[PDB]
C-alpha cells in the first residue's frame, strides 16, 4: 500500500523479479533496482545500497548470495529490524546456510 | 555500596523484608517473561530455517522456468528492463502482539495494475506465463520469510533486554538487602544486651545496699 | 513513634480496641486528606449492624462488599501494573483500575472547609456508592457481553459516549445538603441514574 | 530453625564434625529416596581410609574421584544445556551427561520397601561402579578416536546398537545377594563386562 | 571498632573538630594511598583562607569549584551507568567520566616514599590541577561545538589522536622538586599546555 520491495542482482535475477512485479518510477524518476554486470564497481554497489537504505519507503531488499558476500563488511555495518535485507540463491552460486548475517545473530544455536 | 544507609530499628526490619519480597516478585515476573520470549524465539528460528530450505528449491524451479522461456522465445531482458513504470506487488505495514510487545510484519498485496500483459504477443508467451506464476509464488514466500526475519531480530533484542534487567536485579539488589538486614539484626541485639547489663547492675547494687541491713 | 507498630503500648491497644483506624504516612504526604490506610485498619463491628441494615436500608451491604472488593483488587494490581510499564492493561484490568481510582479520588475524600462536605448523610453515601457501582457493573457487563460475541468494547468508546455521565458522576460530590434538600438530592441522583441508563442503552 | 545454617550451635558443630550428610525435603517431594544432596555433603576421613581401601580393593578411590568429578561437571553443564535446549551439543559432553544420568538412576538410589534392595554389599557397590565407569571410559575413547579418524560415532548410534547393554546396566541392581551367591554375582558381572568389551570391539 | 562511624568516640569528635579527613577501606584494598573518601570529608576553613590565597595565587577558585562539580557529577552518574551498562552516554557525560578517572589516577593517588613523590608543594599542585582543568575545558568545548556542525569529535577519536599526551599527563608527577628547580617545572608545564592546545587545534 505504501512500501515497495527492492532487488539488487545480476541481469537474470533482476529480470526475473521485475517480471515478478516490483520496480516503480517514483516522483524523482528512479527505479527500485540496480543492474550489476561484470562491468560494475563495488563502490557503485555500496552507493546504491546506501541510497536504498536512506529511502525509507523500500522496506525489503533482496540480494543474491555472492554479492552479499562480496560486500560483507558494509552490509553487516547496518543493524536494524525495519529495513530487512534477505540473501537468496542464484544459478552458479547456490545459497549457503553457513554464510548469512541474520543467522550470525543466532550464533551457536544449531 | 555495602548497605542502605538507615539507622537500625524495629520498623526497619519489616521495611527491608518488604523490599526483598518486592524484589523477588519482580525477579519472578521478569524470569517468566524471558522464558516465554525464549520459547517463541526457538519456534520462529525453526520456522525460518524450514521456510528457507523450501525457498531454495522453489527459486531453483523458477530459475529453470526462466531457462525454458529463454529458448522458446529467445531474449527479452531489455524489453522488460527499460519499460518499468509501475509496480504490480505491494507491501503494507502490520504488527502482531506477542508477549506484551509488537512484532512488525508485512502484508503482501496484489496491486490490480499491469505492465507486461502484451509482451511477446506473437513470438510466444506460454513460458512467460509459467515464469509469471512461478515468480508470483516466490515473491509471496519471500515476503513471508522477510516478515519472519524482521520479527526474529526484534524478539532477539527483547530477550536481550529482559535478561539484562533480570541479571541486574539478581546480581545487585538481593545481597545488598540481605547484608543490610543482617547488620540491623546485629545492632538490635547489641542494644538489647546493653540494656540487660544495665538492669542487671542496678539490681545487684540494690541487693548490695539491702544486705547491709 | 516513627509511624510503626514497634511500640508496646500500640500493641497492647491493638489487642483490646475493637476498631482500629490506622493512618498511612505516604498518603498523608500525598495530602489525600483523610490519610486512611485501607489495608491495615479494621472494624470488628460490621456483623453487629446487619440487623439494623436489614431493617432500614437493605441495600448497603452488597454495595459495600463490592466497593471493598474493587478497592482491594486495585491495591493488589497496583504493583503488577507498576512493574510492567502499564502497557499490558487487560480490559477488566482497565475497568477495575479506572473505577477504583475514581472511587479513591472522588468518593473517599472530603474537605472540611466547604459547607457541602462537613457531613455526608448515610443515605447520601448509599446513593453515591449505588450510582458508582451501577456504572461500574453495567460497563463491565457490556464489555464482557460484547467480547464473546463480537466487537469487544474498550474504554475509549465508553468515554466518548458517556463523557457527560462521568462528569455528572464526579459532580455528584458537590450536591450541597445546605442548598438542596434530601428530596432534591435524591431526585438529582435518580435522574443522573436514568441518564446513565439512557446513554448505556443507546450504546447497547 | 527453618533450615537457616547460621546458628552458633550449628556453625560450631560444623566446625567440630568431620563428615556431613546434608538432607533435603525437595528430593522426597521429587520421589527420590534416600535424600542426599551430593553437593553440600562432604567427608574428611578419606585420608585414613586410603590404607584399608588399598589393602582390599585398589579401585574405590580412583572410581569415587571420577564419579564426583562427573557429577559436579554435569551440575555445571545443566545450565548450558538449558540455554541450548537439551537437543544439541558435542558428543563427548552428551555422553558425560548420559553417564551422569546413569549414575543417578541406577547407582545413587535405593528402595527400602523392596526386600532385596535394603542392603548393598560394599564389594557389590564397588563392582557396579567399576563396571559403569569402564563402560563410560570405552564409550568416550571410541567417540574421541572416531571423531577425527573416520565415522564419528554419535550417542544415538551407541545407544541404539547397545540398548541391551543399557538394559543390563539398569538391571544390574536386581541381584539380591541375600539369596544369590557372591561368586555367582562376580561371574555374572565379569561376563557382562566381557560382553560389553566384545560389543565395543564389534562397533570399532 | 570496625569502621562504623556511629560509635561514641567518633560521634563526640565530630561535634568538636573542624577539619574531618574520613578514610575508606575500599581504596586501601586497592592500595590507593592515601585512602581519603573525598565525599564525606569537609573543612570549615574554606573562606578563612580566601584572602591569603588571593594575595598570592588567585588562579585557584575556579579550579576548586570545577573539580568539586566534576567529582560530584561522576559520583552521581556512577550508579546509573552501573545499572545500564555504561553504553547509553552522551558525549558530555563521557567526557566528564573520562576526565574524572584521569584526575583520580593523576592527583588523588600518591605515595610518600617514591623519591620524586615524597613531597609536593602547593604551587605544583595548583599547576597540575590547572593543566587538567584546561584539558577538560578545551576537550568539552571542542566536542560540544563540533556536536552540532559536522564531523562530531568522538572520545575514541581524540584518544587516538593524543594518547601520547595523555601519557605525558600521566607522567607529570615524575619531577622530584628537591632536585629539579621550580622554574624548570613551570616551563615544562607551560610547554605541555601549549602542546596540548596545538594537538586540540589539529583536529579543531
Curated annotation (Swiss-Prot), chain A:
Please provide the record's keywords in A-Z order: Cytoplasmic vesicle, Hydrogen ion transport, Ion transport, Membrane, Synapse, Transport
Keyword presence, Membrane: yes
Q: Which family does it belong to?
A: Belongs to the V-ATPase F subunit family.
Organism the protein comes from: Mus musculus (Mouse)
Q: Which NCBIfam families match?
A: V_ATP_synt_F (TIGR01101)
UniProt cross-references to Pfam families, sorted A to Z: ATP-synt_F (PF01990)
One GO cellular-component annotation of the UniProt record comes to: proton-transporting V-type ATPase, V1 domain
MF (Gene Ontology)? proton-transporting ATPase activity, rotational mechanism
- Give its localization: Cytoplasmic vesicle, Secretory vesicle, Synaptic vesicle membrane; Cytoplasmic vesicle, Clathrin-coated vesicle membrane
UniProt name for this protein:
V-type proton ATPase subunit F
Main location per UniProt? membrane
| GO process annotations (BP) | synaptic vesicle lumen acidification
Membrane topology is: Peripheral membrane protein
Assembly information from the UniProt record: V-ATPase is a heteromultimeric enzyme made up of two complexes: the ATP-hydrolytic V1 complex and the proton translocation V0 complex. The V1 complex consists of three catalytic AB heterodimers that form a heterohexamer, three peripheral stalks each consisting of EG heterodimers, one central rotor including subunits D and F, and the regulatory subunits C and H. The proton translocation complex V0 consists of the proton transport subunit a, a ring of proteolipid subunits c9c'', rotary subunit d, subunits e and f, and the accessory subunits ATP6AP1/Ac45 and ATP6AP2/PRR.
Function of the protein: Subunit of the V1 complex of vacuolar(H+)-ATPase (V-ATPase), a multisubunit enzyme composed of a peripheral complex (V1) that hydrolyzes ATP and a membrane integral complex (V0) that translocates protons. V-ATPase is responsible for acidifying and maintaining the pH of intracellular compartments and in some cell types, is targeted to the plasma membrane, where it is responsible for acidifying the extracellular environment.
UniProtKB/Swiss-Prot annotation, chain B:
Report the principal subcellular site. Answer: membrane
A single Gene Ontology molecular function, please? proton-transporting ATPase activity, rotational mechanism
GO cellular component, as recorded: ATPase complex; centrosome; cilium; clathrin-coated vesicle membrane; extrinsic component of synaptic vesicle membrane; nucleoplasm; plasma membrane; proton-transporting V-type ATPase complex
Q: Where does it reside?
A: Membrane; Cytoplasmic vesicle, Clathrin-coated vesicle membrane; Cytoplasm, Cytoskeleton, Microtubule organizing center, Centrosome; Cell projection, Cilium
Q: What are the GO BP annotations of this UniProt entry? A: cilium assembly; protein localization to cilium; synaptic vesicle lumen acidification
Keyword Lipoprotein present in the record's keywords: the answer is: no
Q: Name one Pfam family in it.
A: ATP-synt_D
Q: Give the way it sits in the membrane.
A: Peripheral membrane protein
Q: Does the keyword Cytoplasm apply?
A: yes
**What InterPro entries has UniProt attached to this entry?**
V_ATPase_D (IPR002699)
List keywords of the entry alphabetically: Cell projection, Cilium biogenesis/degradation, Cytoplasm, Cytoplasmic vesicle, Cytoskeleton, Hydrogen ion transport, Ion transport, Membrane, Transport
The record's function comment reads: Subunit of the V1 complex of vacuolar(H+)-ATPase (V-ATPase), a multisubunit enzyme composed of a peripheral complex (V1) that hydrolyzes ATP and a membrane integral complex (V0) that translocates protons. V-ATPase is responsible for acidifying and maintaining the pH of intracellular compartments and in some cell types, is targeted to the plasma membrane, where it is responsible for acidifying the extracellular environment. May play a role in cilium biogenesis through regulation of the transport and the localization of proteins to the cilium.
Question: Which family, according to the similarity comment?
Answer: Belongs to the V-ATPase D subunit family.
Q: State the name under which the record lists this protein.
A: V-type proton ATPase subunit D
From Swiss-Prot, chains C, D, E:
> Which intervals of the chain form a coiled coil?
none
Q: Which domain of life is it from?
A: Eukaryota
Compartment(s) where it occurs, according to its Swiss-Prot or TrEMBL record: Cytoplasm; Cytoplasm, Cytosol; Cytoplasmic vesicle, Secretory vesicle; Cytoplasmic vesicle, Clathrin-coated vesicle membrane
The UniProt entry's sequence similarity note says:
Belongs to the ATPase alpha/beta chains family.
* Assembly, per entry: V-ATPase is a heteromultimeric enzyme made up of two complexes: the ATP-hydrolytic V1 complex and the proton translocation V0 complex. The V1 complex consists of three catalytic AB heterodimers that form a heterohexamer, three peripheral stalks each consisting of EG heterodimers, one central rotor including subunits D and F, and the regulatory subunits C and H. The proton translocation complex V0 consists of the proton transport subunit a, a ring of proteolipid subunits c9c'', rotary subunit d, subunits e and f, and the accessory subunits ATP6AP1/Ac45 and ATP6AP2/PRR.
The protein's role, per its UniProt record: Catalytic subunit of the V1 complex of vacuolar(H+)-ATPase (V-ATPase), a multisubunit enzyme composed of a peripheral complex (V1) that hydrolyzes ATP and a membrane integral complex (V0) that translocates protons. V-ATPase is responsible for acidifying and maintaining the pH of intracellular compartments and in some cell types, is targeted to the plasma membrane, where it is responsible for acidifying the extracellular environment.
What is the name attached to this protein's record?
V-type proton ATPase catalytic subunit A
Q: What is the lineage of its organism?
A: Eukaryota, Metazoa, Chordata, Craniata, Vertebrata
Span within the parent record: 413 to 616 of 617
Amino acid at each position: 500500500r505504501g512500501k515497495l520491495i527492492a532487488v539488487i542482482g545480476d541481469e537474470d535475477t533482476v529480470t526475473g523479479f521485475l517480471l515478478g512485479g516490483i520496480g516503480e518510477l517514483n516522483k524523482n524518476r528512479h527505479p527500485n533496482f540496480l543492474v550489476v554486470e561484470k562491468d560494475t564497481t563495488i563502490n557503485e554497489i555500496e552507493d546504491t545500497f546506501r541510497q536504498f537504505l536512506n529511502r525509507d519507503d523500500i522496506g525489503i531488499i533482496l540480494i543474491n548470495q555472492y554479492i552479499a558476500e562480496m560486500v560483507r563488511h558494509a552490509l553487516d555495518a547496518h543493524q536494524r529490524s525495519i529495513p530487512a535485507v534477505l540473501e537468496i540463491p542464484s544459478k552458479e552460486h547456490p545459497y549457503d546456510a553457513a554464510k548469512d548475517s541474520i543467522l550470525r545473530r543466532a550464533k551457536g544455536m544449531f | 555500596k555495602d548497605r542502605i544507609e538507615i539507622f537500625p530499628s524495629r520498623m526497619a526490619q519489616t521495611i527491608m523484608k518488604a523490599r526483598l519480597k518486592g524484589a523477588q516478585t519482580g525477579r519472578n515476573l521478569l524470569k517468566k517473561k524471558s522464558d516465554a520470549l525464549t520459547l517463541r524465539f526457538r519456534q520462529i528460528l525453526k520456522k525460518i530455517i524450514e521456510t528457507k530450505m523450501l525457498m531454495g528449491e522453489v527459486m531453483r524451479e523458477a530459475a529453470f522456468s526462466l531457462a525454458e522461456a529463454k529458448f522458446t522465445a529467445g531474449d527479452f531482458s531489455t524489453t522488460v528492463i527499460q519499460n518499468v513504470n509501475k509496480a504490480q506487488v505491494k507491501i503494507r505495514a502490520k504488527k502482531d502482539n506477542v508477549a506484551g510487545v509488537t512484532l512488525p510484519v508485512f502484508e503482501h498485496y496484489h496491486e490490480g495494475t499491469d505492465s507486461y500483459e502484451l509482451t511477446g504477443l506473437a513470438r510466444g508467451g506460454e513460458q512467460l506465463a509459467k515464469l509469471k506464476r512461478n515468480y508470483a509464488k516466490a515473491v509471496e514466500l519471500l515476503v513471508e520469510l522477510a516478515s519472519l526475519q524482521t520479527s526474529f531480530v526484534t524478539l532477539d533484542e527483547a530477550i536481550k533486554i529482559t535478561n539484562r534487567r533480570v541479571n541486574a536485579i539478581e546480581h545487585v539488589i538481593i545481597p545488598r538487602i540481605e547484608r543490610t538486614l543482617a547488620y540491623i539484626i546485629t545492632e538490635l541485639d547489641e542494644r538489647e544486651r546493653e540494656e540487660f547489663y544495665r538492669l542487671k547492675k542496678i539490681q545487684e547494687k540494690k541487693k548490695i545496699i539491702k544486705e547491709k541491713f | 513513634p516513627g509511624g510503626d507498630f514497634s511500640d508496646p503500648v500500640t500493641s497492647a491497644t491493638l489487642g483490646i480496641v475493637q476498631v482500629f483506624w490506622g493512618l498511612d504516612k505516604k498518603l498523608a504526604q500525598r495530602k489525600h486528606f483523610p490519610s486512611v490506610n485501607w489495608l491495615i485498619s479494621y472494624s470488628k463491628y460490621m456483623r453487629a449492624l446487619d440487623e439494623y441494615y436489614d431493617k432500614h436500608f437493605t441495600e448497603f451491604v452488597p454495595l459495600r462488599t463490592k466497593a471493598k472488593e474493587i478497592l482491594q483488587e486495585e491495591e493488589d494490581l497496583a504493583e503488577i501494573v507498576q512493574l510492567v510499564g502499564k502497557a499490558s492493561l487487560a480490559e477488566t484490568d482497565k475497568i477495575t483500575l479506572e473505577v477504583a481510582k475514581l472511587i479513591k479520588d472522588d468518593f473517599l475524600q472530603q474537605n472540611g472547609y466547604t459547607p457541602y462536605d462537613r457531613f455526608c448523610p448515610f443515605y447520601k453515601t448509599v446513593g453515591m456508592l449505588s450510582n458508582m457501582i451501577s456504572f461500574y457493573d453495567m460497563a463491565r457487563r457490556a464489555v464482557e457481553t460484547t467480547a464473546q460475541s463480537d466487537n469487544k468494547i474498550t474504554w475509549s468508546i465508553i468515554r466518548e459516549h458517556m463523557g457527560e455521565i462521568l462528569y455528572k458522576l464526579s459532580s455528584m460530590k458537590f450536591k450541597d445538603p445546605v442548598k438542596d434538600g434530601e428530596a432534591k438530592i435524591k431526585a438529582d441522583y435518580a435522574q443522573l441514574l436514568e441518564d446513565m441508563q439512557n446513554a448505556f442503552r443507546s450504546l447497547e
